[PDB]
Symmetry: T
Subunit: 150 residues, 12 copies
Amino acid sequence: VDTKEFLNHQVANLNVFTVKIHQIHWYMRGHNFFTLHEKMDDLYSEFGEQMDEVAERLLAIGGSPFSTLKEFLENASVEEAPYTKPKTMDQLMEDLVGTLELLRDEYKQGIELTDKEGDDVTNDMLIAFKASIDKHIWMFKAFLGKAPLE
Amino acid sequence: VDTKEFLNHQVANLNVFTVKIHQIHWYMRGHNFFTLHEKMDDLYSEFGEQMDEVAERLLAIGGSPFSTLKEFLENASVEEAPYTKPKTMDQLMEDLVGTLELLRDEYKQGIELTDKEGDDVTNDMLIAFKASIDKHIWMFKAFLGKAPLE
Amino acid sequence: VDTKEFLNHQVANLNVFTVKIHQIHWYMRGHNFFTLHEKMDDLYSEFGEQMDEVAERLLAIGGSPFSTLKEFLENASVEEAPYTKPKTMDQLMEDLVGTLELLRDEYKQGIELTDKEGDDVTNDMLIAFKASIDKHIWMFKAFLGKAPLE
Amino acid sequence: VDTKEFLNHQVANLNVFTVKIHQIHWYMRGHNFFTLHEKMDDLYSEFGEQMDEVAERLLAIGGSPFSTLKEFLENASVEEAPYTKPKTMDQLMEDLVGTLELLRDEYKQGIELTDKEGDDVTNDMLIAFKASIDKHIWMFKAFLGKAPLE
Amino acid sequence: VDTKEFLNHQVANLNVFTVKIHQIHWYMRGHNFFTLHEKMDDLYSEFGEQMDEVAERLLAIGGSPFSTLKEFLENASVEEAPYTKPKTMDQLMEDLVGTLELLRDEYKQGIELTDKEGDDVTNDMLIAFKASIDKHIWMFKAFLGKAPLE
Amino acid sequence: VDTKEFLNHQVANLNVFTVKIHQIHWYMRGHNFFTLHEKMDDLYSEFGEQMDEVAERLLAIGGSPFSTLKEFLENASVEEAPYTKPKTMDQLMEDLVGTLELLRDEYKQGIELTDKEGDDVTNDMLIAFKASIDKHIWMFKAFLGKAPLE
Amino acid sequence: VDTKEFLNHQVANLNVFTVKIHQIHWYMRGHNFFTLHEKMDDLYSEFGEQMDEVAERLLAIGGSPFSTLKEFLENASVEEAPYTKPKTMDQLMEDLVGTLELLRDEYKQGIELTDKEGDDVTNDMLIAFKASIDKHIWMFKAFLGKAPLE
Amino acid sequence: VDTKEFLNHQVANLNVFTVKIHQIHWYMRGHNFFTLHEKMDDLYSEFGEQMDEVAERLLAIGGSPFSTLKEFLENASVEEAPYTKPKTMDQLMEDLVGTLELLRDEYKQGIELTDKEGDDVTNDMLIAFKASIDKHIWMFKAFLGKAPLE
Amino acid sequence: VDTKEFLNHQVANLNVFTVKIHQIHWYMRGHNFFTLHEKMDDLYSEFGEQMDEVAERLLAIGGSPFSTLKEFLENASVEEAPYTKPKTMDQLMEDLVGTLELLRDEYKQGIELTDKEGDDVTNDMLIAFKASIDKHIWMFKAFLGKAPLE
Amino acid sequence: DTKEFLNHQVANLNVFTVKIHQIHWYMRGHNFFTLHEKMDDLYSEFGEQMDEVAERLLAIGGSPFSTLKEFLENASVEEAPYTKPKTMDQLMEDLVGTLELLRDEYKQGIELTDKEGDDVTNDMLIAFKASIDKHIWMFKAFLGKAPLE
Amino acid sequence: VDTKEFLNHQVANLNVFTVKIHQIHWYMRGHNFFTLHEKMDDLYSEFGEQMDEVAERLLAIGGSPFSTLKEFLENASVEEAPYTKPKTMDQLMEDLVGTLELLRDEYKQGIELTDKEGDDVTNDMLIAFKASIDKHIWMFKAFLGKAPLE
Amino acid sequence: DTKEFLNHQVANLNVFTVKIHQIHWYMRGHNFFTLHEKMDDLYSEFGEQMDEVAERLLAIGGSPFSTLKEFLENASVEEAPYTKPKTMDQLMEDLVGTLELLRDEYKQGIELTDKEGDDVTNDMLIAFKASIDKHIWMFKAFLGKAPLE
């Protein structure tokens, strides 16, 4: 697996993720609704920007980003489920935290990979994104009454 | 079809549409690249906001929006295709104009539908969206050297 | 009943309502105090502006808005009660949602009435207000762990 | 008359009207000069925008807007007279109020017309403009010490 | 009388007063309509904020603010009258100046009282409010062609 | 021709010119549509401001500005034609550049005239406007692939 | 008389003038109070800036600006009188207009003088200031129901 | 104690207090994490500013503020404890409320002290700070479901 | 002396003081020119606003402010001298510090006076001004290498 | 070493910004307005790169070139007088070429500073290269070409 | 020493350092007082932000930041001394520059350590902070007339 | 003529902005922060003068110099490499000197364009000179000197 395949894989991942953030944003209920609803708006913007930047980096290294929902589903390792049963706020936030941890570890693989391949720019980009992702994992786990690595 | 089903269909449509806008945004080449590149960012934001407002309206009337790429693919009438053969700027803009016209005509059907069901709010929302889509159809058709309805 | 009497009635209702928003704003306690306190400031501004526009529209059609607390009490259908026994955040929010539902249904009546008398402008105004009120009913009921319209 | 002809007619009307607004802006005298001078600047921008939006709407439905002073004079029903003998602030404001009432009633006819032809977007646009015109008529008639419908 | 009762009394007074400002804002006519209309918006905001700070200060000292129109009418010393006969701009402004003078003198009483009970914070708050009210009395009486305190 | 009549003549010119800018704005088609569409918006604001400043200067020197479309048509040397046969983007831009060169030359005569009459203020004003016009001629001729003085 | 003496004379003049503007600002009474009071704030700032720029220009040409009230009184041709008798709004505005006309004519002498002396920078500065002064003379005379040169 | 010693003591207190605010900011967990996390950012800035202003006031009256952590620990009466065992949101907020009450009462003593020594400026400064502290105590006690003085 | 006479004396003082600030602003030379030049602009604005607020307070309590340079010269205790012999930056700053100390001590006398006359508003106003002056005395004395009270 | 490289890039970046102005002044064609404003943007961005590089060189104890003579004597970027405007595609080709030169030279600087343990200068150059790569994609797309083409 | 302990040690360092910046801010005297006073304000904000970011990073990797002055004193290697004997501006700046060089070198060890442990995020963060610190050392040493590495 | 003058000032202004950067990078002393930011301000202002002059030259049918070589060959402003930082007073003396040179040359351009009937270029140069005179007063005051001294 090389840099282009990793960035394209993350394009698929991030599209599935922003749709998931919309799902939480729309279906959440409970006493933390206002704060976590606005917060999901913030996350949607942030990872939409991550997605645009990953696609633009892929383009800049001569790659071709996935650009259809078909390709995003076919290639993403992030998972999604239709919202049938009502979920508690904690359950939605655990789904979010799980996806954030997936994206963190996959980005770690991308950082190591781009280091071996000598792609310093992509490396730096992935590191910055991971920094934000770690911050979120800490904050949302704090919401869940848990330690970041718990 | 009723109002809830129509709005949900438009949620699917707009997700497919915004990803299509991203496709044009990433893969376009030619002398108009900078202008239409920024223009695609603007359209992405605008129809992202349309989708947000449609989903929020569907929520406010007791509906349940589609919230996965699987559901969007299963329900959208907007057509997507992976970017394989290279396309000219005029060709990408013709795809954009085509989907805008589809959304226009479906929005007209939704306006008549909601006006028949007595949902005044959704009616007004759809009319505002159509106002904007008609403007975009005029402008992009002008870019293509054509009259709006031609 | 005609358009003028309806708008004036809503002047009375909206004054009683903004004062109610102040009651909730001042007397609320519980873990969501900070978020819901700011939220009540927002609602006070929003419905203060709704009240200003209803009065200005009433003036523009040749009407005379109620302009004293006495007239407001005499004509408003929104009910107010002095704050004697402590209420929980959920009790205050249920009162708020109740008044929002009252305003939604009465605004629906005004939309139908103004559409019957051929007052297009007042109709459009009430429809925009109802759009926002429906949004609020969804969000606050979501705060209460309930579906909108439930 | 149909929708296209009506919109074009209002383009001519709005050009004659904005020029009249400039006339009052330039020639007014009296103790309310500073307030009403700035106010005329505001109206000039607002009705310049109405004109731009009416023309863009006309373009979007396949029409061809008038685009010369000759066509405006030949087609406008708004009436203009060169400033000759000095006029009082109340006289100029009466001219403005009269033209505003002309535009109000003609917009009423257009709202009915677009409602008959099923042009929902143009109907909504004209309704918004009429809301603003009604507000202005109330305020300027108040300036003249008169009721909005007096 | 003590500090809590005074602040609550001013809650009632300021609610009756802001509604009065709305009455003047809506019903005014004459050559100064535009300037005094905007000015009334400013006063409504300013004394709305004074009312919010008086209530928040009352809460902060362990008091319970009046929070209904009924309590406001029952306890406020500011007098309100329904708008039946037309009033001139000068009559409305004289009513406004009168209520400002009432508030000035009562605030003077509260400054002396709170200085007597050792409530430094409430004293400082009332003194700032009186500073502004005195400024308003000067300016509006100047509008009336009169000296302040005359 | 003296200074007052020169400024009034330019009031007419600038009114016919801004309407022409609107014509180009509305009827343009082709690949440069978006950039030149916004650019025409900018030019309309700028030359509207020049016109307002010219009229205010005419007022300040004891003049009486033209304030009707009839006066503008009778006195303007700028040429207008209703948009009948379709024109290319280069043709509309060549019309615009032509009118700009007309305004440049007439302003040159106004600068010489005002220097002759000792009108330092109007001289300075016309020089500033001419600076702007010269820049516009350079940029639009560069757009047309032409030298500024070509 | 040379450039330095003229600029220093205008430093004295402008200081006396800004104090006069404060006088009008403080002592004015009448129905135009709010507009003309704020307007005097605007004028105070504008001519304070003229004064700073004249002094900085004098410094830049090797001169030494007056910098005491003593020097301002001893050198200014603008006149001032203590406010003893109450004046009407029109009387204050006539005093202002008179001072503006004095400053206009003296600036005209400075423009001619700096032209003969070849001081283009000071010339341009004085011309810009005069442009504003003419605009004010027109506007304030319009307030007085008079033509600018009347 | 005199004014200088009191102000220096409050410098030490405010440094210990801001560090405590950071402690709560970092270690909080629970469903209100996002709101109270931002809230702690706000308090950290506000009380950082109180500290800066207290120190600058101390400098202005000829005192010498503590300027090392050692002096802060040796002189502060605010008490700090390292975060060891996990604490609930209510436990941390109780610590904050307690420290706020300590600062409130000590500020009361300082207001009396500066009032005795005739230090009007420091008296006023401490009164403003106490107003803010009283507001915070009301709000945070409301968060804990308690009355401000309970 | 009473409150009105004191405030009027301070109007005279502050006019002389702001002109002195302008003198330092124009004539200063040395390595600190840029910093102290901007600093003088800031002080000019600040004490200009002090003078505005003092005059407005004098108006609000029924007084009549001095409004000519003649009256300011006749009544101010602040000393001005024409700039003849060149002065160093330290010397100009010592003049500034001297006048700031004069205003401080006179403001202390006014604070005691107004507190004795029971004018709480003017008392608070003067205390705020003294707070700022004490800060400035600290900073400029620090610039001069001195302790505040030295 | 690192100092020699950064100073070289000061010269390169001064020649480059002057060239950006050259394109800004001499461009003609239907894309004039968009690319004219675009050249303003590029001039700001690489003006800032140049300032930031010089500040880094100073921060590590170096002395930046600060005269046009030193820039000409040291820069590897190439400039040519325009008599003459050239087509828009020609100017964009020149710009893309200089961008690729700066990209590759910056890559050499990243490797150099990595070997020398200058983490800060390494990070700075990586950030600049990220932007330069984006520009190469966009201007190459303008020219109807793939990025690495 | 590992990454968690390194970051915590830097939390202590940055707290002692910001308090030191406050010391310099408060006690500085001399001709450069104003510029360096504001500059110390800026440094305090910047290094406060570095400290907050370091603690948030420590939290994100499963660490527990020091959160008391006692922990800061016991763990910080940055040196502080109470301000007793007066110091010159160059002495305070030399203390500041010294602490900056300490932080630069300790951050260099943290960069090497984090590179060793594979902590790409913390590595990148420390590099950004070190970039800023290197710039500050250059600028402050230039202020002291010294070379950066001198 | 006017075109020759404006193009000469393009060269002058490019040499000047590079010199402003030179002062910005090499200054040391107690006034470092104020004059460092001040040099940022001057670089922006004369950068804009340079752009505006070039745009005027284009607007009158000229072709601006657009390479460092042309700037060196045509500019009357003088530059010297700094090895070497120099005192703050020395850098400010150099700056004031270039400002006076630009002032006098701009005066010649005002007279020239006045004789040639180019009112626009005349007004532009007069505005620039106004600013340059203000700067000469302020920097001369910084040096403890009278403006025309």
